[PDB]
Design a protein around this ligand. Structure first.
Ligand SMILES: Cc1cc(CCCOc2c(C)cc(-c3noc(C(F)(F)F)n3)cc2C)on1
Ligand SMILES: Cc1cc(CCCOc2c(C)cc(-c3noc(C(F)(F)F)n3)cc2C)on1
Lengths: 296, 238, 247, 30, 247, 296, 30, 49, 50, 30
């Protein structure tokens, strides 16, 4: 029965039942169907006109909430003597949604998802305290965020030609400005994203497992447009993503064990319960014990 | 006399020959819970005549140093009759109350009683940061007395207590007071053992006085539950 | 021009705001929609599906052993078999259920529940049980005489291997809450207990210990509100390979 | 709401889909 | 885009501004409304209810003793019993009343008042009083001959235990003010006095001292405006447990 | 009589009255009813067309006014050597409306209230003067205010994972921005809030008295998103709440004695009048004395 | 006034309720 | 049980109704006051004030 | 949202500007108007007196 | 002009009153 549900269903009054051949409270779990027993059939009920709305559990409302997807700190300074491992006034991030547990677990409640993303970038700056540096003050810098799709070259320096962005989508924003905000469409080459992928990425046997090639996004390169200054600073960029226009398919069991990696669904659990490999739920003394027993 | 009134309420009845009127709290009458306001889907029990009847509490002596008395509902009626049994065996209740306060003297007696039904009369303590305890609040059929009737025992004023549904017993005028309280609560039903919807307070604003032979002058309180309902039947818990 | 003035809340980023933002890729054509089985439009459809209760959440129970309750033949009448704490908002048998998992993302809940039990003995093992729900207010019943006074179902083993006990919405307030105070009047739901209505009788060739599986689900009455962060997932450090996304 | 953008995916969340079929998960039998 | 420019008052937080702000919890469904007795929609309904005056605001009066005025039998004619200062805006008998409390939240008031007195003697104690309201301009009358020249009611004790004296709105200006200057022409309301029209005669078995209770209320004529902070509540430090809300 | 009242009632002219059996000025306080005597019946009046509006005393206008509900100062600095008692670049507040007397007393004039809240957050910063610090200047920081409902975990550090706020409602705002403003709906599980609760919170006898569990709100956690800097600062956050869409039931006597605590209605009064336990109103010489007597 | 928000509780104060029944506190007798 | 609260006043008399509350359809004289077919109950007076 | 841009003269206080500002006292009812003799509506009436 | 405020006194100056009676100051005789 497909219908429009805006409120919880009402209750109807019921009377004494004693009829042969009818056993509403008896079910068959083996069929794979949930019990269809009604409260009106198990107890004697009254008429209740239920006015509880159900708009808060809509998948759109459930998932349309900005969540931290990226957070990166780098030093904005003179990087002449820095090693070839630090972010020299810029960084690149391979976009993914598996780095922060809250959004990952919310998204992984479904097998397939189709949505547009709303990207918000929030930048903070702090004055470096290394050595004998003082507060000085916080400069108002300009940052450039460029989206490099798959196959496009990514910048290697803070002043490389790639930043001219002839066709790549870039956003220039100040720290004193509100957080930058854009919208990315549903970029999948399929009709929906694959939250879980029971396959391998390549045509050979050495490809990655569990990552769908169709769901590849690209890179987000963030640089400071300003040239360095006599004193060093630490710039932290946070990227939040909000799904919208969502369609969800095949809900899944929630994850109980802590996440181990962003590349796979590997599990080891906690040392003791709750959420341990051998005991998800915390233990009680026996099946005849309740911990929070009201005693008076 | 000044007015006569009879109150049946079941197998009981009260007649008053010297009354003023009776008060309906906020101009409303008790009623049963409608289907468009119900929450619990269990079929309720409505004993009616078994519970909707006058219960008379112990009398209190009207002395000269009296500060006042209070009874919390349904706490006072819990453990009294079929109403008490239904409260003990059920998890939720719902009921109004018809309250009749009785006090008579002679025509040489003077004194004024304020009889007020305070909704959600959350009490406070005096000269301490600790909150009132369970034993300070739950007094049962015996009720309690006012520590400081001037502030109503909550830091407010007794002078403004007439904002609540109230009457007076002026010995010169009448000897009884009647108040009809509907169901007062933010929820359609409630657990009877942990929350009191109403508090009946009788305060001696004008002290008792006379120059004739002294006699014991008591004050009697009768409460009739009205339109009682009960949900959540299980074992008795008292 | 138009005269204007900015209000409080101007330039601030509320994570639950609902506006339209700049399309970063103009004229982009999304992939055509194709029909996929099993679409979900409300999260109340998921909670309505029944899932196993971890009633045997005790030490010496490992893995799947925690998902079944073993019942043997007793030599005394009216004996208590087990009880289930009805605290979804706290760690217990109902915590790792579809209804429990989805509800722990919200603060307020309302509606009725169904608790189904499937008997998994042999064809010719017989018995009768009594499943009882007790509305809150007192201690958990320990005897059948006290337990029968609440809501209950007498279950007779037969061709239908499963029975249902309805935990109806009997609440004073209009909703209930997660509190972390199980004894709070706004959170406590009552108790569920199982007793022997008769004994479990099996022949010599049948196993003398049989097993029950418990499931719980929500009805159409169910409703949730005041979405929050689920306390079931945390993070103490960066996940493996997370930093490699910047290399 | 306002959506003066030329692309339709730039609009705000569409929280008005109240149709549902729970029986595809609760009674998926014949 | 639309050309705009910001006006003075842009970005400033006026605590009395009336705008719509961002809903922090989208799609939240509030609890259904249920009928509760005693709904208040205007604060002028509260002031219209009569409350006791603290006429006996003198030392040696403690607690409830300040809420009644004792009258005995006198041996001289035309004697003054008591007077009531009509200054709501200053500390006096009218300060801790419903009308007074609610009015001290505003600066300007207008309308008529009613002052009711209930005699609380014995059934067979008799007397006659005269209650007089004197419009402002001069000193408070001290004799019955001077007091009768203003508004007044002669009250005879009987079956009806209460009398009402109306303090009508006799003002030059269109409203009145709280000033803290009681003698200001924009604030002073006049005086209220009580005299013996006859004596209080009681028999030997009745108490020779009887009591009056005074109440004051506002009529439908009443009106208030220019809301302010009530000077009846203050705070010198943090309340107990207030800081524990951060622990 | 329920009607629409927009102005104060008009007065009608009256004549001499001498009629047996009619005594409008005589009343019966014992009935519990206020005197119904009219000015037209007590004195001889004239016709007055009254044009005074009554819109300022509406409960909505009376209560729809932003008032300080929270005020917290904390040090924004390096908190490595600070004790486990100070706010280390963040704080949490258990929301309540009983901490500041003005709003508390205004709200406590009714037994039941139903309204939506409008929350405004105003942040100020000052340069720490402890030791030998100088003015330096005031940084433009970003603050995050997260609402944690009951049962949700609250952050324990300024950089804990809880701040990613997958589902919790957060607002990010700068100090240079206007004060942050959001709206919270009527969150009660009942049809109205209980300003006063004559009950206990739990099912046992050790629960709190006077606090309704149904009216529980949650926690407001405020952090500085910026990382600390070489110099310390003091950040003060003020939270104002404005009721709107108000419904009020069962007006109550105003509180006369000073508030003692936010947890209870305990009272001790002032040492002397006014507002003392034994004398609410200040004393005069006698009942035949007026202090502000006009003498000429 | 404007209220371009999707939730109705986000609107501004509704200061247009001029109905009142003082007699429920002044004459609560029969 | 069944009762009436009586207040002295202008009406000097009050009535208490002993209604027919019987299990059987009639009652009997027995000489056994404690017999189930004869016993009618009790009447008591207390001070309300 | 609506795309906008600020013009020169934005945020500046011209003492002769004619706009509406926030009412600081909501729902306030001013005193009813009463007829007073000698109302002036243009300043050219005053100069016309000798 | 715009006046999205709920109070009427918040509006802008009303510079459209062109009626005048100078004779009440210039010929106040009979
Ligand atoms: C599942 C699942 C969800 C998604 C969508 C994530 C979108 O990722 C981003 C992010 C986080 C930022 C930008 C971005 N940042 O800046 C810019 C611009 F300024 F250049 F426009 N674009 C673009 C994409 C596709 O992909 N798979
Ligand atoms: C009586 C009575 C009145 C109330 C309502 C008080 C609302 O409390 C708050 C406050 C003060 C702030 C926030 C809040 N601060 O920030 C945020 C956000 F940014 F995360 F959205 N929400 C939320 C609530 C419920 O509750 N009981």
């Amino acid at each position: 029965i497909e219908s429009i549900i805006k409120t919880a269903t009402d209750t109807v009054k019921s009377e004494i039942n004693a009829e042969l051949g009818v056993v509403p409270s008896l079910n068959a779990v083996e069929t794979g169907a949930t019990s269809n027993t009604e409260p009106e059939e198990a107890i004697q009920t009254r008429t209740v006109i239920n006015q509880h709305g159900v708009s808060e559990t809509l998948v759109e409302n459930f998932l349309s909430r900005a969540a931290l997807v990226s957070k990166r700190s780098f030093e904005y300074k003179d990087h002449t003597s820095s090693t070839a491992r630090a972010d020299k006034n810029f960084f690149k991030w391979t976009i993914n949604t598996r780095s922060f547990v809250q959004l990952r677990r919310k998204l992984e409640l479904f097998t397939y998802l189709r949505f547009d993303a709303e990207i918000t970038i929030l930048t903070t700056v702090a004055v470096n305290g290394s050595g004998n540096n003082t507060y000085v003050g916080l400069p108002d810098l300009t940052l450039q965020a460029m989206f490099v799709p798959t196959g496009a070259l990514t910048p290697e320096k803070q002043d490389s030609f790639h930043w001219q962005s002839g066709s790549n989508a870039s956003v220039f924003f100040k720290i004193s400005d509100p957080p930058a905000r854009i919208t990315i469409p549903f970029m999948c080459i399929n009709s929906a994203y694959s939250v879980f992928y029971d396959g391998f990425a390549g045509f050979e046997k050495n490809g990655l497992y569990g990552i769908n090639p169709a769901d590849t996004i690209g890179n987000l390169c963030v640089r400071i447009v300003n040239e360095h200054q006599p004193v060093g600073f630490t710039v932290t960029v946070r990227v939040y993503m909000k799904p919208k226009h969502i369609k969800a398919w095949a809900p899944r069991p929630p994850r109980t064990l802590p996440y181990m990696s962003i590349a796979n669904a590997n599990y080891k659990g906690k040392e003791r319960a709750p959420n341990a490999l051998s005991a998800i739920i915390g233990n009680r003394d026996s099946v005849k014990t309740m911990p929070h027993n009201i005693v008076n | 006399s000044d007015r006569v009134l009879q109150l049946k309420l079941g197998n009981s009845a009260i007649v008053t020959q010297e009354a003023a009127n009776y008060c309906c709290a906020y101009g409303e009458w008790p009623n049963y819970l409608p289907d468009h306001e119900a929450v619990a889907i269990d079929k309720p029990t409505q004993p009616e005549t078994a519970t909707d009847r006058f219960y008379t509490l112990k009398s209190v002596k009207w002395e000269t140093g009296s500060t006042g008395w209070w009874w919390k509902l349904p706490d006072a009626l819990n453990n009294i009759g079929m109403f008490g049994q239904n409260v003990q065996h059920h998890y939720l209740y719902r009921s109004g109350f018809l309250i009749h306060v009785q006090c008579n003297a002679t025509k040489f007696h003077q004194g004024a009683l304020l009889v007020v039904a305070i909704p959600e009369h959350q009490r406070g303590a005096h000269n301490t940061n600790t909150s009132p305890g369970f034993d300070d609040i739950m007094k049962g059929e015996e009720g309690g007395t006012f520590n400081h009737p001037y502030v109503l025992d909550d830091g407010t004023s007794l002078a403004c207590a007439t904002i609540f549904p109230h009457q007076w017993i002026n010995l010169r005028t009448n000897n009884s007071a009647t108040i009809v309280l509907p169901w007062m609560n933010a929820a359609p039903m409630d657990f009877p053992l942990r929350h009191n919807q109403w508090t009946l307070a009788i305060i001696p604003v004008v002290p008792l006085g006379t120059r004739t032979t002294s006699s014991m002058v008591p004050i009697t309180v009768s409460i009739a539950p009205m339109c009682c309902e009960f949900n959540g039947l299980r074992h008795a818990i008292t | 021009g138009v005269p204007t003035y900015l209000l409080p809340g101007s330039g601030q980023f509320l994570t639950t705001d609902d506006h339209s933002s700049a399309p970063a890729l103009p004229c982009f054509n999304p992939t055509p929609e194709m029909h996929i089985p099993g679409q979900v439009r409300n999260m109340l459809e998921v909670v309505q599906v029944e899932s196993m209760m971890e009633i045997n959440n005790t030490e010496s129970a490992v893995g799947m052993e925690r998902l079944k309750v073993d019942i043997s033949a007793l030599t005394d009448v009216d004996q208590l078999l087990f009880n289930i704490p009805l605290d979804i908002q706290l760690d217990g048998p109902l915590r790792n259920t579809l209804v429990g998992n989805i509800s722990r993302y919200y603060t307020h809940w309302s509606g009725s529940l169904e608790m189904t039990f499937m008997f998994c003995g042999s064809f010719m093992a017989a018995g009768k049980l009594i499943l009882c729900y007790t509305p809150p207010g007192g201690s958990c019943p320990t005897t059948r005489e006290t337990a029968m006074l609440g809501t209950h179902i007498v279950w007779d083993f037969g061709l239908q291997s499963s029975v249902t006990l309805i935990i109806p919405w009997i609440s004073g307030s209009h909703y209930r809450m997660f509190n972390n105070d199980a004894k709070s009047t706004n959170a406590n739901v009552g108790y569920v207990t199982c007793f022997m209505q008769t004994n479990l009788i099996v022949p010599s060739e049948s196993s003398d210990t049989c097993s029950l599986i418990g499931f719980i689900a929500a009805k159409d009455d169910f409703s949730l509100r005041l979405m929050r962060d689920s306390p079931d997932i945390g993070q103490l450090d960066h996940l493996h390979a997370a930093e490699a996304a910047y290399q | 709401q306002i959506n003066f953008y030329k692309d339709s995916y730039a609009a705000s969340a569409s929280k008005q889909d109240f149709s549902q079929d729970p029986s595809k998960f609760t009674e998926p039998v014949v």
